[PDB]
């Protein structure tokens, strides 16, 4: 099972959302829909792209010649020319290949870590006014409209304003 | 009243290889390796390279009676030959320092 290979805390992911790479699906009265975390995608697209740009741009270029010709009485030159040309060929294959396998995990781990820290951000923003329903889905004990919901997407949230509402939750349980 | 965490994922057949696994499918990818060629030579450094028609460098430099179609092709960037150039030198002999002549004549203005 490939999904078992990663054993990630999040499921396969969504497809309806199109305006980002990491986002939220806010549900509430009169307010359902998807959303995108504009802070994370712009700050994650650039670094990954610059890694690709760094790889591409650092291949400096200069005029190069082909393997020259030699007569049958100068075979030593021909094999020396083959040895140097093959040495570079063998070097670049291993160097180029092992770079894109070692740095493919770096970007894949970067994406996995990006989900986790963003997931941690909502957890710490509000702690007792939420229930761990399951795979990265909280449930608000209180009532929270769209203006309230944007507080989670912001870095702003007034715990004491809603902590007293969590006292009403304590009454239900 | 729920908020959930997820990541965008669209339909794509792109595949990439890594160390923990292989043949994994990803959304967007960029390659470094080019394996496509036009199949036709082109004017490279703004100057049309000369094309030798059934002739070799020694045969044409020495002025064989053939290879007369390539006299007005002075400036170039490189020289294109034929895999088995036949009409080279008519009178047989051993052309001294052949290889060095080709390298020096590989580029002129």
């Amino acid at each position, epitope marked *: 099972g490939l999904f078992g290979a990663i054993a990630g805390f999040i*499921e396969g992911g*969504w*497809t*309806g959302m199109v305006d980002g790479w990491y986002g939220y*699906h806010h*549900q*509430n*009265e*009169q*307010g*359902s*829909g998807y959303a995108a975390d504009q802070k994370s995608t712009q700050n994650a697209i650039n670094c990954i792209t610059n890694k690709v740009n760094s790889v591409i741009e650092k291949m400096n270029t200069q005029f190069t010649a082909v393997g020259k010709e030699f007569n049958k009485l100068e075979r030593r030159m021909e094999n020396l020319n083959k040895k140097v040309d093959d040495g570079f060929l063998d070097i670049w294959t291993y160097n180029a290949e092992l770079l894109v396998l070692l740095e493919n995990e770096r970007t894949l781990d970067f994406h996995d870590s990006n989900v986790k820290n963003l997931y941690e951000k909502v957890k710490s923003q509000l702690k007792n006014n939420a*229930k761990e*329903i*399951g*795979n990265g*889905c909280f*449930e608000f*004990y209180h009532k929270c409209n769209n203006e309230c919901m944007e507080s989670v997407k912001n870095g702003t949230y007034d715990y004491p304003k809603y902590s007293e509402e969590s006292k009403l939750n304590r009454e239900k349980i | *009243d*729920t908020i*959930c965490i*997820g990541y965008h994922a669209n339909n794509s057949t792109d595949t990439v290889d890594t160390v923990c696994e292989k043949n994994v499918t990803v959304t967007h990818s960029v390659n470094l390796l080019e394996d496509s060629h036009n199949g036709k030579l082109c004017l490279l450094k703004g100057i049309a390279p000369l094309q030798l028609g059934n002739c070799s460098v020694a045969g044409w430099i020495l002025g064989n009676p053939e290879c007369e179609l390539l006299i007005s092709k002075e400036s170039w960037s490189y020289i294109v030959e034929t895999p088995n150039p036949e009409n080279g030198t008519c009178y047989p002999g051993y052309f001294a320092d052949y290889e060095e002549l080709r390298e020096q004549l590989s580029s002129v203005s």
Partner: antibody
Amino acid sequence: EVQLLESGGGLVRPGGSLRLSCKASGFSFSRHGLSWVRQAPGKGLEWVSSISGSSLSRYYADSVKGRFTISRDNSQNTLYLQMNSLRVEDTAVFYCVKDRLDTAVPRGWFDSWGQGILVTVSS
Amino acid sequence: EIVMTQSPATLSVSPGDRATLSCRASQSVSTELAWYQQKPGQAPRLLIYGASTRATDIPARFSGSGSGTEFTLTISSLQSEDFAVYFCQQYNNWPPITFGQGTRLEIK
């Protein structure tokens, strides 16, 4: 297989109250939601209410908003439909539908459908 | 709320032919849509969830196609069982749910 049972239909006058019990079996009720749909005679279905797991998420259709109440019992794996102030246009069958999942995303499509029951009104 | 409608309403077609009836959609509701059967006599069932795949134990002669507002349904072959009432549902925005008005198909 998944089977549901419904009861509580009959004749209720305006201003009364009715309780429809909707039992659930064959699937994990704790981790799955439930909802209700209503079909007037001759017209299309008009969804009324849907409730997610553990009785923390409640939503009601605007037509009956503020005058219906829904509760669930995990031990008896049954759902209730509490309501009052019967209408004259509310003569409709009331089916039971199973929400996909609680923790999942894309939610709303119904897999299992019970027979339902008939609730009417009289002058 | 999200308003949905289907049109035309009444249509009769010979069995085994092709008959498609599309239901419009306000907004876009992405690809999230459901189509339901209702044979005369019992409760409705489910055919296509997500507008791309069939449910469990469903004949494959149906076809779920469409995107955004333009949403259509087509059937490869029609039998005497297929003559039923069709409902199309959207669930992208889910404070409310809105069904169609139902399209009836019959013969004889």
